[PDB]
Design goal:
Number of strands: 9
Strand order of the largest sheet: 2-1-9-8-7
Largest sheet: 5 strands, antiparallel
Function: Is probably capable of hydrolyzing cephalosporins such as ceftriaxone and ceftazidime, thus conferring resistance to these antibiotics.
Binding site for substrate: 206-208
Bound molecules: CEFOTAXIME, C3' cleaved, open, bound form
Distance between the termini: 14 Å
Active site: 42 (acyl-ester intermediate)
Protein name: Beta-lactamase CTX-M-97
Number of domains: 1
Catalytic activity: a beta-lactam + H2O = a substituted beta-amino acid
Length: 260
Amino acid sequence: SVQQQLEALEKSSGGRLGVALINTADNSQILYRADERFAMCSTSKVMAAAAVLKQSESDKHLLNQRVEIKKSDLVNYNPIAEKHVNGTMTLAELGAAALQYSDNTAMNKLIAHLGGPDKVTAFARSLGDETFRLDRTAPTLNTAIPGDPRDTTTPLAMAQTLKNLTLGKALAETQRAQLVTWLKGNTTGSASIRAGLPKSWVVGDKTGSGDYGTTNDIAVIWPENHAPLVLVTYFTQPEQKAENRNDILAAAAKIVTHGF
Ligand SMILES: *C(=O)[C@@H](NC(=O)/C(=N\OC)c1csc(N)n1)[C@H]1N=C(C(=O)O)C(=C)CS1
């Protein structure tokens, strides 16, 4: 069965695997450790971007607001922000960079604009997500220490919130569509969930990786002839310097979408 296949995969991999699939045709679910907490790592960047999109529902000028990028703003991984040092980026551009390239400076600028990680958490709560918590900025939110509740959520909570953000009632239509455009244009996920799916399916996703070999992806999936699927795959390991394992996320995706 699917459950037996995921257990075997987890056992052989030497870690802890969390999966939540929602089939929006009938709201059926495939769950595996879906109520356990996992470190989100950069998958949290979806919530920071969405919180700024929510602000833009009531403030037409916001997304074109310019933010200065200085050398001191740069942290450990900033492929887009580094190209704009001593220039500006708009909040929309920062949203795009955080999601499509996982730029950590872009994330921190969004958080600073919102007023801190607690403001991202409050946004999640406003959507009915009582599980999500953001505690730190980038890159320290990727420490992924076993048992640490900081910067964690559960696979099921994240699947439900992602469904609400991209297909449901969380955002007004213009904003919903913008988030979906950004996720579809992700450049970092080729070897993760996408690699376990039919090539012709359309995928929007956000990856994240951190210490303890923590390797995550959250995705919305549009099949060619069926209703969308929402899939969260979280994976973490017991040793701090473990290799990341995008291949395990691809394998899990293949397992839970099979037959269909
Ligand atoms: C989000 O997860 C960001 N993760 C990191 O920066 C991690 N180190 O932070 C202390 C990290 C990246 S790889 C690894 N073994 N740890 C990254 N956003 C990711 C992502 O997978 O989406 C990368 C593109 C770069 S940074």
